[PDB]
Amino acid sequence: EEEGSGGPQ
Amino acid sequence: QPPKCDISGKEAISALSRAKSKHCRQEIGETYCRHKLGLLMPEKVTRFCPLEGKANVEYMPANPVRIAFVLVVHGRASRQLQRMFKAIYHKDHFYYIHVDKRSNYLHRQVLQVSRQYSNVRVTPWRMATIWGGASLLSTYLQSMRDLLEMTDWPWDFFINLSAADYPIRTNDQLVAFLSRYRDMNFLKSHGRDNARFIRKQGLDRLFLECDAHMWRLGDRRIPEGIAVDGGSDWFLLNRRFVEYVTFSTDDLVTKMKQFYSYTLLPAESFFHTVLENSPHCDTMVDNNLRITNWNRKLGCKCQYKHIVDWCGCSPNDFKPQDFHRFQQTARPTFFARKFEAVVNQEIIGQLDYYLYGNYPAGTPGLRSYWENVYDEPDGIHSLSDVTLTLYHSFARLGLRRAETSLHTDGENSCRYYPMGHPASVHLYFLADRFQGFLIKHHATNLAVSKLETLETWVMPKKVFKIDFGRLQFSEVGTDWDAKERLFRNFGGLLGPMDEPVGMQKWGKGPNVTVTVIWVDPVNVIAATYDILIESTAEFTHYKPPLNLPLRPGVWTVKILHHWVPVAETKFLVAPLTFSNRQPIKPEEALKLHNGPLRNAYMEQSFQSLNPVLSLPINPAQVEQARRNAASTGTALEGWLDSLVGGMWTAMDICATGPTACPVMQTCSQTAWSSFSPDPKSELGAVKPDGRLR
């Protein structure tokens, strides 16, 4: 399970 | 008013052009100017950590910790929240609930809880915590100040939870674990390359929250002299660290609060960055004690593009096959997410009984779920003309059931006349199968001339109709959820100005190509197209471009394989009886119920196909549809009610209080009513052991 909710631009 | 600065950045001009309010455009310009002069963002920040880099249950505690739970909630799922609150409650902890400003129904239900228990309070301030918004950090930081000043609440740890979280271990183990490590802070880092984390989070971009939207305004530099980190925004922080974050005035805390006021997803890196650069850096454990159901294959579809100027992801809902994951022993974990009762309740039930045991035999409602989707105090203007029209129709469908269910040759004491508007509407689920709507409404019993309050259960008729192919199901609706693979418009309620979406569900097998045909209520073929069903395909969907308004009535969608029929389904485009929550007028009815402006729904025509598929167009039915299009009042109500009755069934109807209809049960005595017992979500008195469950 990698964390962080941001996608890209 | 012109800006104080020349504004030339592409992103800022695009933001000013799309903004809707004067106040918002002013705030945008002011922010841009200040950053332009280099007076907005800090460029270098002091690091106080002496380290070179990062730091990194069956006993009874003599001095157990007391926990402050901060619940940040939104939506309609009040009963699932009540079940979870029941699982985590103990008289020694504290519960501080912030309800999104936009969820007034939920806030009214939460208020009833806070009034029952002295260790439960609600935030008097309420923010509109949009996804990714900067306001989520403002929410946390304000609740920390509030909580530190409540001297009657001596708490030791801070834990944040949403309405989609659930515990996977008992309260006794949580306290024992935290009681042993009370000087630690629990945060999880991204676990990858830091440069890629910064780019993907947009931390080098400037964001501004205004009008419930996150506007991207340009670039900015990462300040020098500090290590930037981030990961999950779900954590547990001890009181000593919360005190530091809240009251410290040193260089690190001051500049970081300024930096993160204009940051997308700020709670995913603010607390990681402060801690690692602060005097408390040696207390960090790289583990937030959570299981997050990431499935970035399905949850990264840039589904928030209309709310923020960025692409985001979110975790999936757990299903029953995931239960074994809650039993892992690799690392300590105490909570998990996500859960949705309207998506899958079985796994929630499995988990609750595993931690706290089965309910007594004969307990009712364990496999059911009720969710309120309209409550009168919020007003009919919060509904749409579609839902208002159809909820009225469902109520009338129930009143006609009551009359026909009494068999007499004298006066029928089950004849009713409807009054006013629906008081509430509920979704009804049984064994994870959608059962329809429950409508509470008022009506006069005509035999005794007395007002009565009733609840009606309406259920949709099955319409899917199916040589061993791959197709499993086909459905038409709106608001398709690509992550959970379902329509969030559960009833498939549609009006003439709606844009339907067709979905298909496939099983395993070789690749195949199929044809889709849309047919309107007078046999006009609106669209045709072929789709490729790859070997690995499980769901397919497409929204055909149809000129509006759509002709009202029962539409049909057919699937063929080289002209060989496969299956069909039907859906209802209902005529509207309301315009601006007012009885529709003749001139607005004619504009809305006579099909799209351009005689044709698309550019290409399909008249060449009507004979081939045996869909002849009856000249009489066409003229009758034109005649129907000009009707109002009683004639229109009779047309709608004849349509609804052909696609919906009134399963049952009950009375909430005394009634003169001798054949109607009391709602509390039913299995299906929102008034019936639901002990798994009911909150009573605190037991001797300090629990509610």
mmCIF file of C-alpha atoms in Angstrom, chain B residues 54-274:
data_model
loop_
_atom_site.group_PDB
_atom_site.id
_atom_site.type_symbol
_atom_site.label_atom_id
_atom_site.label_comp_id
_atom_site.label_asym_id
_atom_site.label_seq_id
_atom_site.Cartn_x
_atom_site.Cartn_y
_atom_site.Cartn_z
ATOM 1 C CA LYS B 54 14.541 10.664 9.920
ATOM 2 C CA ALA B 55 14.088 8.752 13.192
ATOM 3 C CA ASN B 56 11.779 5.733 12.681
ATOM 4 C CA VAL B 57 -0.970 -6.160 23.652
ATOM 5 C CA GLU B 58 -2.886 -8.487 26.004
ATOM 6 C CA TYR B 59 -1.892 -6.750 29.267
ATOM 7 C CA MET B 60 -3.896 -4.290 31.384
ATOM 8 C CA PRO B 61 -2.308 -0.827 31.741
ATOM 9 C CA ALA B 62 -2.027 0.708 35.189
ATOM 10 C CA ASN B 63 -2.276 4.219 33.670
ATOM 11 C CA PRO B 64 -4.431 3.914 30.527
ATOM 12 C CA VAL B 65 -4.423 6.726 27.963
ATOM 13 C CA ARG B 66 -7.602 8.699 27.229
ATOM 14 C CA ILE B 67 -8.293 9.401 23.548
ATOM 15 C CA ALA B 68 -9.813 12.424 21.800
ATOM 16 C CA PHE B 69 -11.553 11.203 18.634
ATOM 17 C CA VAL B 70 -12.091 13.907 15.989
ATOM 18 C CA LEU B 71 -14.762 12.856 13.474
ATOM 19 C CA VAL B 72 -14.941 14.812 10.193
ATOM 20 C CA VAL B 73 -18.131 13.628 8.494
ATOM 21 C CA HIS B 74 -20.382 14.325 5.517
ATOM 22 C CA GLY B 75 -23.198 12.788 3.472
ATOM 23 C CA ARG B 76 -26.387 10.923 4.345
ATOM 24 C CA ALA B 77 -25.175 7.657 5.942
ATOM 25 C CA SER B 78 -26.177 8.552 9.489
ATOM 26 C CA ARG B 79 -27.033 4.982 10.520
ATOM 27 C CA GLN B 80 -23.666 3.573 9.469
ATOM 28 C CA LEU B 81 -21.972 6.353 11.442
ATOM 29 C CA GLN B 82 -24.097 5.383 14.464
ATOM 30 C CA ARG B 83 -22.979 1.754 14.152
ATOM 31 C CA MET B 84 -19.297 2.776 14.058
ATOM 32 C CA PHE B 85 -19.689 5.260 16.936
ATOM 33 C CA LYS B 86 -21.160 2.356 18.898
ATOM 34 C CA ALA B 87 -18.080 0.225 18.210
ATOM 35 C CA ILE B 88 -15.518 2.844 19.340
ATOM 36 C CA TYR B 89 -17.306 4.381 22.352
ATOM 37 C CA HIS B 90 -15.974 4.158 25.886
ATOM 38 C CA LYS B 91 -16.934 6.518 28.707
ATOM 39 C CA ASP B 92 -13.274 7.482 29.265
ATOM 40 C CA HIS B 93 -12.642 8.830 25.751
ATOM 41 C CA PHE B 94 -13.897 12.024 24.088
ATOM 42 C CA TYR B 95 -15.648 12.620 20.776
ATOM 43 C CA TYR B 96 -15.584 15.908 18.836
ATOM 44 C CA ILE B 97 -17.605 15.863 15.610
ATOM 45 C CA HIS B 98 -17.299 18.370 12.763
ATOM 46 C CA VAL B 99 -20.119 18.053 10.208
ATOM 47 C CA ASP B 100 -19.668 19.514 6.726
ATOM 48 C CA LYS B 101 -21.634 22.745 6.379
ATOM 49 C CA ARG B 102 -23.464 21.215 3.383
ATOM 50 C CA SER B 103 -24.857 18.163 5.263
ATOM 51 C CA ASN B 104 -27.625 19.651 7.383
ATOM 52 C CA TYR B 105 -29.598 16.408 7.638
ATOM 53 C CA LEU B 106 -26.555 14.608 9.049
ATOM 54 C CA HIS B 107 -25.891 17.509 11.427
ATOM 55 C CA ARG B 108 -29.409 17.223 12.869
ATOM 56 C CA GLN B 109 -28.865 13.505 13.521
ATOM 57 C CA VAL B 110 -25.432 14.080 15.101
ATOM 58 C CA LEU B 111 -26.950 16.701 17.413
ATOM 59 C CA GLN B 112 -29.190 14.039 18.965
ATOM 60 C CA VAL B 113 -26.088 12.010 19.905
ATOM 61 C CA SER B 114 -24.190 14.895 21.516
ATOM 62 C CA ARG B 115 -27.242 15.646 23.669
ATOM 63 C CA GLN B 116 -27.246 12.115 25.124
ATOM 64 C CA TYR B 117 -23.615 11.786 26.257
ATOM 65 C CA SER B 118 -21.489 14.232 28.243
ATOM 66 C CA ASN B 119 -18.248 13.200 26.480
ATOM 67 C CA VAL B 120 -19.622 13.932 22.972
ATOM 68 C CA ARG B 121 -19.653 17.440 21.472
ATOM 69 C CA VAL B 122 -20.106 18.973 18.005
ATOM 70 C CA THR B 123 -18.072 21.813 16.517
ATOM 71 C CA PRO B 124 -20.140 25.041 16.490
ATOM 72 C CA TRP B 125 -18.161 26.196 13.457
ATOM 73 C CA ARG B 126 -18.599 24.222 10.242
ATOM 74 C CA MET B 127 -16.537 24.374 7.053
ATOM 75 C CA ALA B 128 -17.260 23.097 3.547
ATOM 76 C CA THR B 129 -14.448 20.540 3.479
ATOM 77 C CA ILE B 130 -14.172 19.825 -0.229
ATOM 78 C CA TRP B 131 -11.829 17.093 -1.417
ATOM 79 C CA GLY B 132 -8.238 18.316 -1.474
ATOM 80 C CA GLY B 133 -9.216 21.691 -0.062
ATOM 81 C CA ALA B 134 -6.930 23.740 2.147
ATOM 82 C CA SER B 135 -9.825 23.990 4.624
ATOM 83 C CA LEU B 136 -9.249 20.429 5.875
ATOM 84 C CA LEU B 137 -6.085 21.595 7.634
ATOM 85 C CA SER B 138 -7.884 24.641 9.038
ATOM 86 C CA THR B 139 -10.484 22.198 10.366
ATOM 87 C CA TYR B 140 -7.881 20.066 12.169
ATOM 88 C CA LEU B 141 -5.886 23.007 13.542
ATOM 89 C CA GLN B 142 -8.983 24.729 14.927
ATOM 90 C CA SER B 143 -10.251 21.536 16.580
ATOM 91 C CA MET B 144 -6.828 21.106 18.208
ATOM 92 C CA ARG B 145 -7.049 24.599 19.701
ATOM 93 C CA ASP B 146 -10.598 23.921 20.894
ATOM 94 C CA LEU B 147 -9.559 20.567 22.356
ATOM 95 C CA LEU B 148 -6.469 21.906 24.167
ATOM 96 C CA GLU B 149 -8.604 24.561 25.893
ATOM 97 C CA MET B 150 -11.233 22.058 27.152
ATOM 98 C CA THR B 151 -9.647 21.599 30.581
ATOM 99 C CA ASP B 152 -12.365 19.154 31.661
ATOM 100 C CA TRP B 153 -11.089 16.733 28.968
ATOM 101 C CA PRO B 154 -7.594 15.401 29.925
ATOM 102 C CA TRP B 155 -6.777 13.490 26.741
ATOM 103 C CA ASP B 156 -3.443 11.964 25.746
ATOM 104 C CA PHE B 157 -3.828 11.114 22.032
ATOM 105 C CA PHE B 158 -5.486 12.657 18.969
ATOM 106 C CA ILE B 159 -7.126 10.378 16.372
ATOM 107 C CA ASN B 160 -9.031 11.553 13.291
ATOM 108 C CA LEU B 161 -11.706 9.398 11.642
ATOM 109 C CA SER B 162 -14.225 9.768 8.832
ATOM 110 C CA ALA B 163 -17.668 8.233 8.365
ATOM 111 C CA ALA B 164 -16.104 5.578 6.097
ATOM 112 C CA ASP B 165 -13.641 4.277 8.722
ATOM 113 C CA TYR B 166 -14.096 1.270 11.016
ATOM 114 C CA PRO B 167 -12.047 -0.368 13.791
ATOM 115 C CA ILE B 168 -10.454 -3.759 13.163
ATOM 116 C CA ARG B 169 -9.357 -4.314 16.774
ATOM 117 C CA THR B 170 -11.036 -3.834 20.134
ATOM 118 C CA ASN B 171 -10.872 -0.708 22.279
ATOM 119 C CA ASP B 172 -9.024 -2.597 25.033
ATOM 120 C CA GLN B 173 -6.105 -3.390 22.713
ATOM 121 C CA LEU B 174 -6.025 0.146 21.309
ATOM 122 C CA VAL B 175 -5.622 1.584 24.816
ATOM 123 C CA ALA B 176 -3.026 -1.010 25.849
ATOM 124 C CA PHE B 177 -0.943 -0.372 22.734
ATOM 125 C CA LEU B 178 -1.032 3.420 22.969
ATOM 126 C CA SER B 179 -0.470 3.317 26.742
ATOM 127 C CA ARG B 180 2.898 1.640 26.100
ATOM 128 C CA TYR B 181 4.047 4.101 23.405
ATOM 129 C CA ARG B 182 2.520 7.328 24.707
ATOM 130 C CA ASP B 183 5.476 9.529 23.645
ATOM 131 C CA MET B 184 5.315 8.480 19.957
ATOM 132 C CA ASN B 185 3.616 10.039 16.933
ATOM 133 C CA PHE B 186 2.155 7.817 14.207
ATOM 134 C CA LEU B 187 2.469 9.083 10.617
ATOM 135 C CA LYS B 188 2.958 7.106 7.391
ATOM 136 C CA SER B 189 5.209 8.453 4.617
ATOM 137 C CA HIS B 190 4.722 7.984 0.886
ATOM 138 C CA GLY B 191 7.333 5.231 0.597
ATOM 139 C CA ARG B 192 8.823 6.152 -2.783
ATOM 140 C CA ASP B 193 10.951 8.818 -4.475
ATOM 141 C CA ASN B 194 10.568 12.209 -2.816
ATOM 142 C CA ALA B 195 10.925 14.279 -5.992
ATOM 143 C CA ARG B 196 8.119 12.306 -7.639
ATOM 144 C CA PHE B 197 5.987 12.754 -4.509
ATOM 145 C CA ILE B 198 6.352 16.549 -4.682
ATOM 146 C CA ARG B 199 5.438 16.777 -8.374
ATOM 147 C CA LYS B 200 2.423 14.467 -8.089
ATOM 148 C CA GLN B 201 1.054 16.276 -5.028
ATOM 149 C CA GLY B 202 1.393 19.655 -6.741
ATOM 150 C CA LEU B 203 3.338 21.018 -3.771
ATOM 151 C CA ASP B 204 5.346 23.257 -6.129
ATOM 152 C CA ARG B 205 2.073 24.821 -7.362
ATOM 153 C CA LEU B 206 0.061 27.592 -5.711
ATOM 154 C CA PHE B 207 -3.593 26.837 -4.907
ATOM 155 C CA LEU B 208 -6.277 29.081 -3.470
ATOM 156 C CA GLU B 209 -9.608 27.953 -1.989
ATOM 157 C CA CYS B 210 -12.624 30.091 -2.975
ATOM 158 C CA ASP B 211 -16.277 29.339 -3.913
ATOM 159 C CA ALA B 212 -15.841 25.662 -2.943
ATOM 160 C CA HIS B 213 -13.163 25.212 -5.620
ATOM 161 C CA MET B 214 -9.371 24.851 -5.609
ATOM 162 C CA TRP B 215 -7.850 27.242 -8.170
ATOM 163 C CA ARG B 216 -4.319 26.685 -9.462
ATOM 164 C CA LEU B 217 -2.575 30.051 -9.805
ATOM 165 C CA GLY B 218 1.007 29.199 -10.789
ATOM 166 C CA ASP B 219 4.368 27.893 -9.618
ATOM 167 C CA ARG B 220 6.303 28.433 -6.402
ATOM 168 C CA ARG B 221 9.586 27.362 -4.853
ATOM 169 C CA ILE B 222 10.103 24.772 -2.116
ATOM 170 C CA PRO B 223 11.760 26.685 0.762
ATOM 171 C CA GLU B 224 15.414 25.952 1.461
ATOM 172 C CA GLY B 225 16.872 24.430 4.608
ATOM 173 C CA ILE B 226 14.194 21.862 5.536
ATOM 174 C CA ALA B 227 13.240 18.305 4.587
ATOM 175 C CA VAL B 228 9.780 18.026 2.994
ATOM 176 C CA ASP B 229 7.839 14.783 3.480
ATOM 177 C CA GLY B 230 4.293 13.485 3.282
ATOM 178 C CA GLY B 231 2.010 10.516 2.855
ATOM 179 C CA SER B 232 -1.337 9.618 4.389
ATOM 180 C CA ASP B 233 -3.425 12.287 6.112
ATOM 181 C CA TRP B 234 -4.679 9.715 8.685
ATOM 182 C CA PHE B 235 -2.556 9.665 11.829
ATOM 183 C CA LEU B 236 -2.369 9.651 15.633
ATOM 184 C CA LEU B 237 -0.596 12.481 17.454
ATOM 185 C CA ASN B 238 0.117 12.819 21.168
ATOM 186 C CA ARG B 239 -0.751 15.866 23.243
ATOM 187 C CA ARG B 240 2.825 17.151 23.500
ATOM 188 C CA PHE B 241 3.117 17.441 19.715
ATOM 189 C CA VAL B 242 -0.348 19.000 19.347
ATOM 190 C CA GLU B 243 0.622 21.603 21.948
ATOM 191 C CA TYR B 244 3.754 22.430 19.948
ATOM 192 C CA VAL B 245 1.918 22.740 16.617
ATOM 193 C CA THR B 246 -0.829 24.885 18.142
ATOM 194 C CA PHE B 247 1.079 27.378 20.320
ATOM 195 C CA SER B 248 4.715 27.484 19.136
ATOM 196 C CA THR B 249 5.907 30.735 17.523
ATOM 197 C CA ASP B 250 9.288 29.519 16.241
ATOM 198 C CA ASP B 251 10.473 29.951 12.657
ATOM 199 C CA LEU B 252 9.360 26.468 11.574
ATOM 200 C CA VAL B 253 5.709 26.526 12.671
ATOM 201 C CA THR B 254 5.047 30.128 11.593
ATOM 202 C CA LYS B 255 6.300 29.794 8.020
ATOM 203 C CA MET B 256 4.800 26.340 7.491
ATOM 204 C CA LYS B 257 1.315 27.550 8.458
ATOM 205 C CA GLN B 258 1.661 30.302 5.848
ATOM 206 C CA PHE B 259 2.973 27.933 3.180
ATOM 207 C CA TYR B 260 0.193 25.367 3.699
ATOM 208 C CA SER B 261 -2.644 27.933 3.601
ATOM 209 C CA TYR B 262 -2.236 27.900 -0.211
ATOM 210 C CA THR B 263 -1.570 24.188 -0.689
ATOM 211 C CA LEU B 264 -3.552 21.356 -2.263
ATOM 212 C CA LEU B 265 -4.033 18.338 0.023
ATOM 213 C CA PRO B 266 -2.199 20.095 2.889
ATOM 214 C CA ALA B 267 -2.933 17.521 5.614
ATOM 215 C CA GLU B 268 -0.997 14.915 3.613
ATOM 216 C CA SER B 269 2.350 16.632 4.261
ATOM 217 C CA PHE B 270 2.075 19.496 6.787
ATOM 218 C CA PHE B 271 2.331 17.312 9.900
ATOM 219 C CA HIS B 272 5.056 15.109 8.393
ATOM 220 C CA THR B 273 7.147 18.157 7.446
ATOM 221 C CA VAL B 274 6.843 19.973 10.784
#
